[PDB]
């Protein structure tokens, strides 16, 4: 199937019509998305099959065809871009300064942008166009607005 690097929609025919359940990144021949988008199921790309290779429910991440390849990190100071891919709509870049999620195990960047659930897996990028994490695992705060963690894996 299509193995060109880039951002892809993840679709299903199991619900009414064709429904976008999420988004992912193809890089170095590996497909990267959030675990909650696919639940670890195999994926189709044209006539080709992509099998899961690594995944972790707690990190909420999964890679297909090979190990997780994305290793850039938010520098903690600069603005980033969410490359949002909403259901039925064109890919669009949104620039923002991340906030922070503070946890007992360390701090993580967070992006306060509101998109539908099927946008999960959309990439967050630095100024070199490197993917510093995926959007779509987060919380709802004291006003109803969505705040996503900048979720990044580990490149072994």
């Amino acid at each position: 199937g299509e193995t060109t690097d880039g951002v892809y929609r993840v679709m299903t025919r199991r619900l009414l019509g064709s429904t976008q359940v999420g988004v992912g990144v193809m890089q170095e021949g590996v497909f990267h998305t959030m675990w909650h988008v696919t639940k670890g199921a195999a994926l189709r790309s044209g006539e080709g099959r992509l099998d899961p290779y690594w995944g972790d429910v707690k990190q909420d991440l999964v890679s297909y065809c090979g190990p997780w390849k994305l290793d850039a990190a938010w520098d903690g100071l600069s603005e980033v871009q969410l490359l949002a891919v909403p259901p039925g709509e064109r890919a669009k870049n949104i620039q923002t300064l991340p906030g922070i999620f503070k946890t007992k195990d360390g701090d993580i960047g967070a992006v306060a942008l509101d998109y539908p659930a099927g946008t999960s897996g959309s990439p967050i990028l630095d100024k070199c166009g490197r993917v510093i994490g995926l959007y779509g695992n987060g919380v709802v705060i004291k006003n109803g607005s969505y705040v996503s963690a900048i979720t990044q894996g580990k490149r072994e």
Partner: protein, 39 residues
């Protein structure tokens, strides 16, 4: 049965729309991968 469809290139775009605030939140991450606000 899930399938993927290309949506674009991964590139930083000059003159992208600029928005969103930068909140600092105390959160907890459970074994199921769910985040919750700590107050």
């Amino acid at each position: 049965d899930m399938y993927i469809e290309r949506a674009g290139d991964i590139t930083w775009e000059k003159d992208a729309e600029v928005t969103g605030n930068s909140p600092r939140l105390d959160v907890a991450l459970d074994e199921s991968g769910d985040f919750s606000l700590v107050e």
